[PDB]
Amino acid sequence: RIKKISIEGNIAAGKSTFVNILKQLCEDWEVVPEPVARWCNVQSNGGNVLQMMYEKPERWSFTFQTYACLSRIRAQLASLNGKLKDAEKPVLFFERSVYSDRYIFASNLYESECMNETEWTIYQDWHDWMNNQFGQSLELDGIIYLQATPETCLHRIYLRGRNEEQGIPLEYLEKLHYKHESWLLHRTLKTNFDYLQEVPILTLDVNEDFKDKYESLVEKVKEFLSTL
Amino acid sequence: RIKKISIEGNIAAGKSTFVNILKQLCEDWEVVPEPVARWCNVQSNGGNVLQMMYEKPERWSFTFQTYACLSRIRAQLASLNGKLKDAEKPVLFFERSVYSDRYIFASNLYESECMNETEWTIYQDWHDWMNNQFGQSLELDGIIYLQATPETCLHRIYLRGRNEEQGIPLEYLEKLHYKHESWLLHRTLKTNFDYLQEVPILTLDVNEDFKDKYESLVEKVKEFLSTL
Ligand SMILES: O=c1ccn([C@@H]2O[C@H](COP(=O)(O)OP(=O)(O)O)[C@@H](O)[C@H]2O)c(=O)[nH]1
Ligand SMILES: O=c1ccn([C@@H]2O[C@H](COP(=O)(O)OP(=O)(O)O)[C@@H](O)[C@H]2O)c(=O)[nH]1
Ligand SMILES: Nc1ncnc2c1ncn2[C@H]1C[C@H](O)[C@@H](COP(=O)(O)O)O1
Ligand SMILES: Nc1ncnc2c1ncn2[C@H]1C[C@H](O)[C@@H](COP(=O)(O)O)O1
Ligand SMILES: [Mg+2]
Ligand SMILES: [Mg+2]
Numbered sequence: 001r002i003k004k005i006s007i008e009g010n011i012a013a014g015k016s017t018f019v020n021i022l023k024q025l026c027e028d029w030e031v032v033p034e035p036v037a038r039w040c041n042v043q044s045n046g047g048n049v050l051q052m053m054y055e056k057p058e059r060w061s062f063t064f065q066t067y068a069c070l071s072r073i074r075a076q077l078a079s080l081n082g083k084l085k086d087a088e089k090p091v092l093f094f095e096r097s098v099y100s101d102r103y104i105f106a107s108n109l110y111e112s113e114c115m116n117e118t119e120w121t122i123y124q125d126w127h128d129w130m131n132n133q134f135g136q137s138l139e140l141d142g143i144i145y146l147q148a149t150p151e152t153c154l155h156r157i158y159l160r161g162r163n164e165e166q167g168i169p170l171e172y173l174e175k176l177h178y179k180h181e182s183w184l185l186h187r188t189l190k191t192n193f194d195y196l197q198e199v200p201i202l203t204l205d206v207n208e209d210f211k212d213k214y215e216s217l218v219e220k221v222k223e224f225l226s227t228l
Numbered sequence: 229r230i231k232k233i234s235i236e237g238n239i240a241a242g243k244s245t246f247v248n249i250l251k252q253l254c255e256d257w258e259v260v261p262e263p264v265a266r267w268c269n270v271q272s273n274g275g276n277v278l279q280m281m282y283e284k285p286e287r288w289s290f291t292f293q294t295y296a297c298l299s300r301i302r303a304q305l306a307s308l309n310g311k312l313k314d315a316e317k318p319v320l321f322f323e324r325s326v327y328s329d330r331y332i333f334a335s336n337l338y339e340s341e342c343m344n345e346t347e348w349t350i351y352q353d354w355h356d357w358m359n360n361q362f363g364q365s366l367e368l369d370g371i372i373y374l375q376a377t378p379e380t381c382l383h384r385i386y387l388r389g390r391n392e393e394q395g396i397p398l399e400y401l402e403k404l405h406y407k408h409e410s411w412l413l414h415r416t417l418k419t420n421f422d423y424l425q426e427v428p429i430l431t432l433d434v435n436e437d438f439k440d441k442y443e444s445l446v447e448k449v450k451e452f453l454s455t456l
Binding site: 044047059066116118 | 294344349
């Protein structure tokens with residue numbers, strides 16, 4: 001029914017900022033923000049599991065990573081039943097997908113030895129079965145990679161200001177950067193979701209500053225969306 | 229269209245042993261064993277998360293408890309599509325239910341301070357949403373409580389021999405015992421699944437030794453099943 005485009009990018013790269021500009025350029029375009037809000041206040045003041053991961057990764061990576069992906073699957077499946085389901089030409093933009101959760105972050109945490117074998121095995125096993133029960137619904141129809149130097153991201157991470165991610169070193173932002181390049185740019189990163197190989201991928205260089213000048217980016221999106 | 233009976237009990241109380249006797253008393257009765265096998269070898273050589281929980285509970289309780297319940301939901305939903313779905317009067321016996329996972333074990337681990345607030349909150353939140361997406365399918369039609377002194381269980385735990393659970397002290401078996409008594413016997417334990425209040429519950433005293441003498445128990449089950 002509804003066309004589901006995913007907005008991939010690094011940390012503080014600028015998805016939200018970007019999609020918010022898109023969101024108000026048509027009432028047939030609804031966004032599904034990353035449930036970061038709830039990751040910072042686990043509830044049904046509760047605990048801030050995002051911070052726990054940052055403070056002691058070798059201990060909370062699993063928990064966080066699991067919770068983070070679930071919360072997303074829900075949030076997205078949820079939006080699929082919004083009043084958007086009625087309009088003529090609907091488009092639902094996702095702030096990051098279950099794919100980048102597992103293949104970019106979880107994956108990298110594992111490689112960073114922050115998830116023992118068992119944790120990574122369980123994580124994958126779960127992640128697989130998860131997208132096999134609600135897969136159909138969330139399959140993407142396109143992906144928009146907001147590319148940006150890990151330097152820029154490190155900078156924007158500071159401009160944003162979330163106190164949890166203020167300790168993030170460039171090394172980290174870098175490792176995640178390559179993970180994106182490898183998957184969405186060079187397409188050398190293999191997943192376990194065959195259909196992802198035949199998915200359109202628009203790559204925009206958001207290193208500049210689209211707060212003001214963004215006319216360009218926008219046109220390339222209308223462009224890209226037509227071809228779907 | 230299949231009647232789902234749950235066989236509740238303590239550790240090494242005798243569900244398996246018992247249900248195996250039931251299993252071969254009619255070809256319209258299929259069992260769904262606890263996926264313990266896989267808990268002892270994640271991705272079937274891997275890791276043994278059951279043991280991890282026992283060695284360092286304050287660290288692996290969450291992971292284990294989460295995995296254990298998921299693995300069950302799958303295992304059970306899976307069996308609901310077996311060739312049993314065809315026979316005339318079908319009955320599917322579950323070795324423990326998602327209810328006892330959360331309300332007996334997870335719950336007790338939390339109270340034993342083996343799950344910090346955050347872990348317990350996330351665990352519940354997840355568990356709730358889980359039985360709200362696949363609830364319908366797994367609702368029980370009856371429960372059979374195999375009652376037995378924590379002493380007997382401690383003994384049978386030794387007869388069985390799983391090296392992971394050889395360190396279990398009576399105190400533990402005891403705590404879990406009361407949790408069962410409170411829920412299935414005195415019914416004073418409140419859950420978050422309204423329908424469980426109106427569920428038939430047969431209680432059998434398996435403290436003796438049904439390996440041989442079990443004619444009795446069996447009749448009480450045929451009896452109980454008729455009333456459903
Ligand atoms: O051209 C730009 C684009 C973004 N930002 C900053 O990017 C931050 C938001 O980063 P964001 O949360 O959008 O990263 P995301 O959550 O989308 O991945 C905002 O505070 C903006 O100040 C900026 O200063 N100039
Ligand atoms: O009357 C009995 C019933 C059972 N068992 C022992 O119980 C063990 C199995 O315990 P079980 O695995 O059935 O506990 P469950 O997994 O059903 O909760 C077997 O090795 C039997 O030797 C026994 O000795 N006498
Ligand atoms: N999948 C996953 N695993 C681990 N940590 C994550 C994940 N997604 C987001 N985050 C965390 C890490 C960053 O501090 C922040 C980025 O939010 P963002 O909107 O992406 O800039 O949230
Ligand atoms: N829900 C749950 N939480 C934690 N540990 C569990 C759970 N279920 C089984 N087990 C473990 C604990 C015992 O050593 C054994 C009991 O298997 P059994 O067939 O139950 O006698 O398996
Ligand atoms: Mg955001
Ligand atoms: Mg058993």
